[PDB]
Swiss-Prot record, chain A:
Locations listed in the record: Nucleus; Cytoplasm, Cytosol
UniProt source species: Homo sapiens
Family classification: Belongs to the RNA polymerase beta' chain family.
Protein name, as recorded: DNA-directed RNA polymerase III subunit RPC1
Disease implication from the record: Leukodystrophy, hypomyelinating, 7, with or without oligodontia and/or hypogonadotropic hypogonadism: An autosomal recessive neurodegenerative disorder characterized by childhood onset of progressive motor decline manifest as spasticity, ataxia, tremor, and cerebellar signs, as well as mild cognitive regression. Other features may include hypodontia or oligodontia and hypogonadotropic hypogonadism. There is considerable inter- and intrafamilial variability. Wiedemann-Rautenstrauch syndrome: An autosomal recessive, neonatal progeroid disorder characterized by intrauterine growth retardation, failure to thrive, short stature, hypotonia, variable mental impairment, and a progeroid appearance. Clinical features include apparent macrocephaly, sparse hair, prominent scalp veins, entropion, greatly widened anterior fontanelles, malar hypoplasia, and generalized lipoatrophy. Death usually occurs in early childhood but survival to third decade has been reported.
Residues of the full protein shown: 1193 to 1341 of 1390
Signal sequence, start to end: none
Coiled coil residues, start to end: none
Tissue: Expressed in the brain, in the cortex and the white matter (at protein level).
Binding site for DNA template strand: 113, 131
Swiss-Prot record, chain D:
Record-stated family: Belongs to the archaeal Rpo6/eukaryotic RPB6 RNA polymerase subunit family.
Subcellular location: Nucleus; Nucleus, Nucleolus
Function noted in UniProt: DNA-dependent RNA polymerase catalyzes the transcription of DNA into RNA using the four ribonucleoside triphosphates as substrates. Common component of RNA polymerases I, II, and III which synthesize ribosomal RNA precursors, mRNA precursors and many functional non-coding RNAs, and small RNAs, such as 5S rRNA and tRNAs, respectively. Pol II is the central component of the basal RNA polymerase II transcription machinery. Pols are composed of mobile elements that move relative to each other.
GO cellular-component term (any): RNA polymerase I complex
Subunit comment: Component of the RNA polymerase I (Pol I), RNA polymerase II (Pol II) and RNA polymerase III (Pol III) complexes consisting of at least 13, 12 and 17 subunits, respectively. Pol I complex consists of a ten-subunit catalytic core composed of POLR1A/RPA1, POLR1B/RPA2, POLR1C/RPAC1, POLR1D/RPAC2, POLR1H/RPA12, POLR2E/RPABC1, POLR2F/RPABC2, POLR2H/RPABC3, POLR2K/RPABC4 and POLR2L/RPABC5; a mobile stalk subunit POLR1F/RPA43 protruding from the core and additional subunits homologous to general transcription factors POLR1E/RPA49 and POLR1G/RPA34.
Highest taxon, organism lineage: Eukaryota
Protein name, UniProt field: DNA-directed RNA polymerases I, II, and III subunit RPABC2
From Swiss-Prot, chain F:
Gene that produces this protein: POLR2E
InterPro entries for the chain: Arch_Rpo5/euc_Rpb5, RNA_pol_Rpb5_N, RNA_pol_Rpb5_N_sf, RNA_pol_subH/Rpb5_C, RNA_pol_subH/Rpb5_CS, RPB5-like_sf
NCBIfam families xref list: PRK09570.1
Function of the protein: DNA-dependent RNA polymerase catalyzes the transcription of DNA into RNA using the four ribonucleoside triphosphates as substrates. Common component of RNA polymerases I, II and III which synthesize ribosomal RNA precursors, mRNA precursors and many functional non-coding RNAs, and small RNAs, such as 5S rRNA and tRNAs, respectively. Pol II is the central component of the basal RNA polymerase II transcription machinery. Pols are composed of mobile elements that move relative to each other.
Protein name listed in UniProt: DNA-directed RNA polymerases I, II, and III subunit RPABC1
Biological processes, Gene Ontology terms: protein stabilization; transcription by RNA polymerase II; transcription elongation by RNA polymerase I; tRNA transcription by RNA polymerase III
PANTHER family named in the record: DNA-DIRECTED RNA POLYMERASES I, II, AND III SUBUNIT RPABC1
Pfam family, any one: RNA_pol_Rpb5_N
Organism of provenance: Homo sapiens (Human)
Highest taxon above the source species: Eukaryota
UniProt family annotation: Belongs to the archaeal Rpo5/eukaryotic RPB5 RNA polymerase subunit family.
SUPFAM superfamilies xrefs: Eukaryotic RPB5 N-terminal domain, RPB5-like RNA polymerase subunit
Keywords: Acetylation, DNA-directed RNA polymerase, Host-virus interaction, Isopeptide bond, Nucleus, Transcription, Ubl conjugation
MF terms in GO: DNA binding; DNA-directed RNA polymerase activity
Curated annotation (Swiss-Prot), chain H:
The protein's name in its UniProt record: DNA-directed RNA polymerase III subunit RPC10
The keyword Cell division is assigned to this record: no
Annotated family: Belongs to the archaeal RpoM/eukaryotic RPA12/RPB9/RPC11 RNA polymerase family.
ZnF (C4-type) intervals: 5-28
Sorted UniProt keywords: Antiviral defense, Disease variant, DNA-directed RNA polymerase, Immunity, Innate immunity, Leukodystrophy, Metal-binding, Neurodegeneration, Nucleus, Transcription, Zinc, Zinc-finger
Entry binding sites for Zn(2+) 1: 5, 8, 25, 28
Residues represented out of the complete protein: 1 to 54 of 108
Effect listed in the UniProt record for changing residue 41 to W: In HLD21; decrease in expression levels of RNA polymerase III-transcribed genes such as 5S and 7S ribosomal RNAs
Localization of this protein: Nucleus
Subunit composition and interactions: Component of the RNA polymerase III complex consisting of 17 subunits: a ten-subunit horseshoe-shaped catalytic core composed of POLR3A/RPC1, POLR3B/RPC2, POLR1C/RPAC1, POLR1D/RPAC2, POLR3K/RPC10, POLR2E/RPABC1, POLR2F/RPABC2, POLR2H/RPABC3, POLR2K/RPABC4 and POLR2L/RPABC5; a mobile stalk composed of two subunits POLR3H/RPC8 and CRCP/RPC9, protruding from the core and functioning primarily in transcription initiation; and additional subunits homologous to general transcription factors of the RNA polymerase II machinery, POLR3C/RPC3-POLR3F/RPC6-POLR3G/RPC7 heterotrimer required for transcription initiation and POLR3D/RPC4-POLR3E/RPC5 heterodimer involved in both transcription initiation and termination.
MF (Gene Ontology): DNA-directed RNA polymerase activity; nucleic acid binding; zinc ion binding
Amino acid sequence: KEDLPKVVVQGIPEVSRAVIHIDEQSGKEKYKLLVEGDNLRAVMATHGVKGTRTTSNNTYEVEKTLGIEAARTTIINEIQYTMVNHGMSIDRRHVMLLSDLMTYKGEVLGITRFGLAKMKESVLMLASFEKTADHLFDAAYFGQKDSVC
Amino acid sequence: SGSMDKGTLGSGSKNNIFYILLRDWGQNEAADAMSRLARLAPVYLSNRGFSIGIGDVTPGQGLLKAKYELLNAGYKKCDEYIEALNTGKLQQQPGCTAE
Amino acid sequence: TVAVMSYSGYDIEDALVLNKASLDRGFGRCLVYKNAKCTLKRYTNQTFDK
Amino acid sequence: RITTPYMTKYERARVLGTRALQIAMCAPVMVELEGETDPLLIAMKELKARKIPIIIRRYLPDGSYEDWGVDELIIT
Amino acid sequence: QGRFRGNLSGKRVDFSGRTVISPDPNLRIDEVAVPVHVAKILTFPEKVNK
Amino acid sequence: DDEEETYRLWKIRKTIMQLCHDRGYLVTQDELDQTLEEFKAQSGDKPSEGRPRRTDLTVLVAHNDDPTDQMFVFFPEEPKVGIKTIKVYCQRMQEENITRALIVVQQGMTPSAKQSLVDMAPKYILEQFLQQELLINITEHELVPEHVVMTKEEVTELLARYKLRENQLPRIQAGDPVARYFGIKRGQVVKIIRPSETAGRYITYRLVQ
Amino acid sequence: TEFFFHTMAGREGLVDTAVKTAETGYMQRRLVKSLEDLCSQYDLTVRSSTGDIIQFIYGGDGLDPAAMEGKDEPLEFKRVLDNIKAVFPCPSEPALSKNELILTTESIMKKSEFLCCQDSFLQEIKKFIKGVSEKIKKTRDKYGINDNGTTEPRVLYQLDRITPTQVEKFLETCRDKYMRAQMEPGSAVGALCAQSIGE
Amino acid sequence: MLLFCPGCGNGLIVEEGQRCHRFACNTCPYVHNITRKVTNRKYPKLKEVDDVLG
Ligand SMILES: [Zn+2]
């Protein structure tokens, strides 16, 4: 009685809420699905959904589902849309360079200390940014020679 | 033709006259034009006079009448909506509740 | 006696233009008082600051 | 010969700085200055007259290099 | 306030000043007015040449 | 059922045909352009259709490289594939002397079966594919650009033009969906054609690592 | 009550700005610390400090965002053409027809100095030339202007007046602007991107 | 529903005896055999048919 009504009978378990958005273009009013879920593969695999034109906001799901280039394109589009929402414009070359830096090792790596450590190699910069003592002791243990490039 | 404003002399976006001078004739010409503007505009603005007073912000009689009519109409429509929601059924907009 | 107007372009952003004759006759004249304190204390030994 | 023939602003700044530092250290002048006590003004005059005896050594990332004269490059 | 952030990446230097600003439209956009008092303190090393 | 299941099977078969055509294998135009009516003519019901055997494909040969090279596509009927099914598929490929095979699972692969498939044999190359991923073609997606695997001559020309090394090129994981779609190995290079906002295109390159 | 509500709104704005200052400061610090290593090399390839390439060409084309005259475009061909017509009005040269304009454009574009230019910019120039030639043709068809140059009302030639001198000036100006708008090697593109995203 | 023993007031569970299903308490020999049908509906809220926006 505590969990029998809470069983899924139809739909994607990761999908929490889907709504029918409509575009009222003068030529034609078309219908699309706005899904507040975290499963892009399941949405594309469902019947009646044109998976060729399905996007998402979560860059990790796009990376895992449609490749690293689709993730880069999603990052670019999402950053540009978020910037335009506030009325301020940024040249596309900057966001393209940012997405390329985030997606040049084959995996979307963030700007946090973990992604910065996975991308960069210089010990001095890793120590100066965050986790000074830990990085310094790890470098002393590994004996990693750091250049001045 | 036309009158100068922020759309043409301000730092908003492109189509600025100083931007056109910078992109067409170099930096020195744009700097000289900006210096001439900054030395000319204050002189004329002081010799002509530009002031704001309490009379520049006071409302007119027609404005007061229009404001009164609009306030009355808006309050009547808001009271009608309140009465419709509290007593009876109110047309619920899509994607949201009645409140 | 403030007059709200633009004058000489030296009051572009929040600035104000003051009158020389007004400041010369005592308008805005201010006084700053500072304190300088010194101590001549007797130590444990029978000697003192002089 | 494959790089841009235009002389970049960074090259301009570095060449002017080196020339001003040299002239400040009793270097010979090749433009016959007329009452210019500032070495940077003399360096700019030499750059405009294209008489700076400095050759830029542009290095490619792999390791290759190429030499470009100041008079050979294009200034703006 | 560590060595990297407070003494390596960003550190204090000499031959510098800090002053309140005031408008002056009679100067070019690439020019800035310096007080005589600060100019007498901030010095520039010029090498004696011909 | 019996309506969505056959549609999923037809779409998976069409996606497999498109993948084989993109990889360079020999597929006729009829197999690439196969309507749902022809699939119903082959089999119109779920019990009539045979997932393990009626859908298997063995005519897949690399006509561009060598007709002797053969590739096989499997469709296990059970949702989770065990060790025994993998062993049966491997011994069947040994009987038919096939080195490259694909496994289209229905729900997933057990971790033991995954680990075994990883280290089956260097000569026996088998790739795991979920039916959920194969319901939509990754190449036809608007976000996914055009990827073309470059030959060794083109990679040499690139490295000579840019005076680069292999490790200096941008990396792309082997587990990438596009990488598994094309079946590219470590050391190969893929040229990517990004469609720009204007009429031009941006050419980039990525090394599998 | 209205004054109290206005003070509430003002305090909400103040606390919003107070939080935004610190949040964007931290974001800017992170972005700059991450992006400060990239630099534009001389081979038009953006590489990191270790030598790994991030982009084979910056922005796909290689143009300076600071020198971007149009809306993410290098030049606004209409404004450049109008400026060329206004600065150099040649009254002693006859107007050009559609065929003559296309011919002189194809003759000038095939020179050596235009070979090193990118193909996309040349295609855009050709598209703009074809568009303006179609406009001139439509005007001459509307007003019956003859390409021989013997029409009695000469003011009709002032509607869409173009001379080969103006064509050459426009093409040379566009080529020079495109050459001077490219990324100068050695620029710290990563720091500029970090700042232009954080601000 | 929630039922309690009249004897001690503890919660009653449903078990199976030798003849029929019965309510029983875990701290006293009190039992109660079920004679007729007993039901406890809850009437869960129906997933309101959402409307299209835009
Ligand atoms: Zn009891």
